[PDB]
C-alpha cells in the first residue's frame, strides 16, 4: 500500500517541500529523464545481498 518498489539509477536532484521535509528527484533504472519523479525521503531504500560475515575476516 506504500507504493511499488523499483531500482534507482541515481538521485538527480533534491529539495525541501512546503512542510520542510526532503524530497528526491529519482532517475529510475531502465527509464529516461521524462519518467523522473519527486519522491519523499521515506520512499528511498538501500538493498543488500545476504552475507556470511565470517568470510570477510582477515587472518595473519
Amino acid at each position: 500500500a506504500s507504493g511499488d518498489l523499483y531500482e534507482v539509477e541515481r538521485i538527480v536532484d533534491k529539495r525541501k517541500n512546503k512542510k520542510g521535509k526532503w524530497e528526491y528527484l529519482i532517475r529510475w533504472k531502465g527509464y529516461g529523464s521524462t519518467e523522473d519523479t519527486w519522491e519523499p525521503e521515506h520512499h528511498l531504500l538501500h538493498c543488500e545481498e545476504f552475507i556470511d560475515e565470517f568470510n570477510g575476516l582477515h587472518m595473519s
Binding site: 523499483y6 519523479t37 519522491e39 528511498l44 538501500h46
Partner: peptide, 14 residues
C-alpha cells in the same frame, strides 16, 4: 556494492 531502490508514488509528481 548496495543497490539503490525506492517506492514509486502513484500518482506521480514529475
Amino acid at each position: 556494492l548496495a543497490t539503490k531502490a525506492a517506492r514509486k508514488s502513484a500518482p506521480a509528481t514529475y
